[PDB]
Amino acid sequence: HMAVYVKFKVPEEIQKELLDAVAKAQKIKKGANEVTKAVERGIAKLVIIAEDVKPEEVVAHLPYLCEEKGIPYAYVASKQDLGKAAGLEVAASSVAIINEGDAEELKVLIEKVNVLKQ
């Protein structure tokens, strides 16, 4: 695979961690338009982007925006799965965690991602 917008590989074990962060979150934003607003306003603490978004242009601006705003981001395989972790019955291309369920887990998972992306 790897779409152009997928800038680093996130293995399955950290993908699960990401999904589980999303499911236990207290407040999220869902979908590219809401996610992009939340990064632009500086309320996202972590952005999670599906790898299988088509058209890819829906999410292709997100890694750049996140990097330019200092916001951590990473990937999961499935937008279906992402939408179910976010409490939906439809897919989500992207999720932003606004208020997380476990602070300490978020800070460990954000570092894990830093490392992946080096």
Summarize the structure.
Helices cover 43% and strands 16% of the residues.
Can you list the strand order of the major beta sheet?
Answer: 1-4-2-3
Determine Rg (CA atoms, Å). Answer: 12 Å
State the CATH superfamily name.
Answer: Ribosomal protein L30/S12
Biggest sheet details: 4 strands, mixed
Strand content: 15-25%
Q: Determine the N-to-C terminus distance.
A: 20 Å
Secondary-structure element order, N to C = HEHEHEHEH
Going by CATH, the architecture would be 2-Layer Sandwich
Query: What is the share of helical residues?
Result: 40-55%
Work out the count of structural domains: 1
Number of helices: 5
The total beta strand count reads 4
The assigned structural class equals alpha+beta
CATH topology group: 60s Ribosomal Protein L30, Chain: A
CATH hierarchy class name: Alpha Beta
GO molecular function: box C/D sno(s)RNA binding; ribonuclease P activity; rRNA binding; structural constituent of ribosome
Subunit structure: Part of the 50S ribosomal subunit. Probably part of the RNase P complex.
Keywords: Cytoplasm, Ribonucleoprotein, Ribosomal protein, RNA-binding, rRNA-binding, tRNA processing
InterPro entries: eL8/uL1-like, Ribosomal_eL30-like_sf, Ribosomal_eL8-like_CS, Ribosomal_eL8/eL30/eS12/Gad45, Ribosomal_eL8/Nhp2, Ribosomal_eL8_arc
